Design a protein around this ligand. Structure first.
Ligand SMILES: CCCCCCCCO[C@H]1O[C@H](CO)[C@@H](O)[C@@H]1O
Ligand SMILES: CCCCCCCCO[C@H]1O[C@H](CO)[C@@H](O)[C@@H]1O
Ligand SMILES: [Ca+2]
Ligand SMILES: [Ca+2]
Lengths: 284, 284
């Protein structure tokens, strides 16, 4: 019944699943502005206890030059290190309690058509949903150091790798004007740690609009059934060209390409790990 | 256009792709009877030059007890070693020219409904399509040591791993009564070698008939779209059960199970590597 409706829904769309996957090519464009603190400072401006810019294992790799707040952690989803502070509670050796409270970030008032209805935080590590929360506040509450309420995130994707935590904007009261992140890592097992980046509201376009019908896409035959309008990379008729994307199921390779997963969300279920879209670029 | 028709075709089937994947659970049931030689002897009864039962790398692993002709190579697709001779041209150290000509095998005269229209050989290694051929003959030709003609196989699947070579039965003349395998491995590069097992005509049932709608199946959400009638393994409503199958795209994991790929073929394109069906059993 569910299976049957899913498939009927799929076939009823001109370009199948490509119309339902929403792609966020520029996660930095959606970042919330800090209320008072400079961008570099805002992520840890409230409190940081044993959360540091390099508190993340090399293997969740590492960049030569540090990002804005000193992190050499390689960031996912084409997050720009020069515009993306990172704080994490991982460390080698002696494990200690760790906590984070960011400064306040401003929620949008200016409407934008191309936004997903989600507050998103790119995060890594292993943690329970209660350990990372989004607090909200009015101007008055924030000024007095209080918050009006809080929510948890849906943790979507495989841990401890980088992934996008999602919180439906619908849960945030309409009078809230500011939000902040709070994290609590009291679990001293070495494998239990948290890394966060600042909050954003994704600006998105459909995968069909982003990928189109001309860019060649690496994908399994099975997976391609759901993406009828995408051009499958192959060599029929002696075709020779450069693949530009790869689509993967949720759970290189001919030509030495770098594959970068781009942030994406399924319109039909914002908490579903649908699979992955990756942009391919010459490894050079 | 192709994409669109594929997807419309998919959705038009009650159980989607499950009706088009044909599964061969018992490859030994389809094995051709040798004309004159005992089963153990027939695979190398004509000529074997540097083709041996253990001429296959451990990593294409290995079994404790040898199979019928002395091979400790672990066989794929639930081939029964006690009924499946193997001969291969791989070796360490000094590389030598290698050739194989099997004895004659009898083509069926008794009709069977559940057969795929293919002559199949399970093979491993790296080789060109010209290096492995199927020869056919009438009784008269075979008796005189001649053959009436020959064909190549479609090599479907990733090399050098085990896979199923396929030759359409339609290509074999109606007067042919016997077939044999011939292989030529003159390439002395160590990575270039061939391993073969005897010819068969697969007995098959649809994946829908084999897997059904009750056995839980491990599969990616994306892949499941094409298999609407299969029960996806998960824990919704606190469901606790043992997964029995896994379906994979063409290009563990929660509970310590052994995964065994079963032989399968896509009815719509016998040369397409559609993906894989695996049977799961307790690793114990
Ligand atoms: C079983 C149908 C075989 C048709 C011939 C090759 C079909 C290729 O099929 C692939 O390409 C399509 C996208 O255009 C997509 O539906 C599928 O993954
Ligand atoms: C976007 C639709 C979300 C519906 C709620 C969960 C859907 C689960 O979807 C999975 O199960 C189906 C097989 O029954 C198959 O179509 C799909 O892979
Ligand atoms: Ca910890
Ligand atoms: Ca060789």
């Amino acid at each position: 019944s569910v299976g049957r409706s899913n498939l009927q829904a799929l076939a009823g769309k001109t370009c199948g699943l490509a119309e339902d996957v929403l792609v966020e090519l520029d996660p930095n464009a959606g970042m919330l502005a800090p209320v008072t603190a400079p961008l570099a400072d805002a992520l840890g401006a409230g409190l940081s206890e044993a959360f540091t810019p390099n508190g993340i294992p090399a293997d969740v790799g590492t960049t030569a030059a540090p990002g804005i707040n000193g992190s050499r952690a390689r960031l996912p989803y084409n997050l720009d290190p020069a515009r993306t502070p990172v704080l994490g509670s991982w460390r080698a050796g002696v494990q200690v309690p760790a906590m984070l409270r960011s400064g306040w970030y401003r929620l949008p008032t200016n409407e934008q058509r191309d936004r997903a209805p989600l507050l998103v935080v790119t995060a890594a590590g292993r943690f329970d949903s209660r350990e990372v929360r989004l607090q909200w506040a009015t101007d008055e509450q924030a000024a007095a150091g209080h918050h009006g309420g809080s929510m948890e995130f849906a943790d979507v994707g495989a841990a401890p790798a980088w992934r996008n935590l999602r919180a439906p904007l619908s849960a945030i009261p309409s009078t809230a004007t500011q939000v902040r992140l709070v994290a609590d890592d009291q679990d001293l097992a070495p494998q239990h740690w948290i890394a966060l980046t600042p909050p954003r509201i994704p600006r998105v376009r459909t995968l069909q609009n982003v990928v189109g019908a001309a860019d060649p896409v690496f994908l399994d035959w099975l997976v391609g059934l759901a993406f009828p309008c995408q051009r499958p990379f192959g060599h029929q008729y002696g075709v020779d060209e450069t693949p530009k994307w790869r689509i993967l199921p949720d759970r290189i390779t001919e030509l030495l390409m770098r594959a970068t997963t781009v942030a994406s969300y399924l319109k039909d279920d914002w908490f579903r790990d649908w699979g992955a879209l990756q942009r391919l670029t010459p490894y050079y």
